[PDB]
Amino acid sequence: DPAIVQCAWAALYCDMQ
Amino acid sequence: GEEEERAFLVAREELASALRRDSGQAFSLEQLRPLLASSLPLAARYLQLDAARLVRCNAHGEPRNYLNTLSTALNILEKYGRNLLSPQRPRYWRGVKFNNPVFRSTVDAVQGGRDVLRLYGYTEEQPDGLSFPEGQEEPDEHQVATVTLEVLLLRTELSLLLQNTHPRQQALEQL
Ligand SMILES: *CC(=O)Nc1ccc(NC(=O)C*)cc1
Ligand SMILES: [N]
Numbered sequence: 001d002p003a004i005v006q007c008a009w010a011a012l013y014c015d016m017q
Numbered sequence: 018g019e020e021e022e023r024a025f026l027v028a029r030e031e032l033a034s035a036l037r038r039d040s041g042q043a044f045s046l047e048q049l050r051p052l053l054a055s056s057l058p059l060a061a062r063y064l065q066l067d068a069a070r071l072v073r074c075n076a077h078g079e080p081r082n083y084l085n086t087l088s089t090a091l092n093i094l095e096k097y098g099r100n101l102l103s104p105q106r107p108r109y110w111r112g113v114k115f116n117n118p119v120f121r122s123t124v125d126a127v128q129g130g131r132d133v134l135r136l137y138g139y140t141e142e143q144p145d146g147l148s149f150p151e152g153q154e155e156p157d158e159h160q161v162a163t164v165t166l167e168v169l170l171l172r173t174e175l176s177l178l179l180q181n182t183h184p185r186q187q188a189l190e191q192l
Pocket of ligand 1: 006007008010011012014015
């Protein structure tokens with residue numbers, strides 16, 4: 001998957017930590 | 018008919034099982050070909066995702082653009098599903114918070130994106146998002162697997178329509 005989407009997901013994954 | 022319906026459902030469980038066994042498992046196009054090349058109509062291909070509305074109700078502008086916006090949202094929703102299937106999750110997986118500007122610009126940028134999270138189990142409405150029922154302590158693995166596969170498949174089918182390479186592009190060009 002494009003790295004730009006992985007940037008998005010990492011921000012959302014942060015919200016769950 | 019029956020053989021085609023059976024092959025489709027069996028192929029779905031093979032992939033859903035792989036996701037339940039390994040949430041990080043990636044699938045190639047060839048491993049998804051049983052579902053992409055299946056002659057089943059759209060209502061039969063997607064049992065959980067309202068894929069008709071997801072595409073048609075976000076079809077604003079050039080297909081190059083709103084298929085990309087929808088692809089990003091589906092990509093993120095897939096990772097939410099894989100996250101619930103991961104045996105190692107972040108501590109507060111039980112709630113999704115909408116206020117995140119990255120959520121607002123990806124999932125909340127398409128109609129129906131929020132509703133997909135409900136199919137994972139994020140069913141209780143919050144002012145700031147959606148969460149699991151406090152009684153439910155673990156997610157329905159089989160349900161999450163099926164939705165995750167459908168979200169993965171829908172993004173895949175959209176990408177193959179984008180490159181003019183869907184095996185059944187003719188019938189699915191209606192979307
Ligand atoms: C491109 C990239 O590295 N993006 C990115 C976004 C978010 C986060 N982390 C948090 O928001 C906590 C890291 C990296
Ligand atoms: N966290």
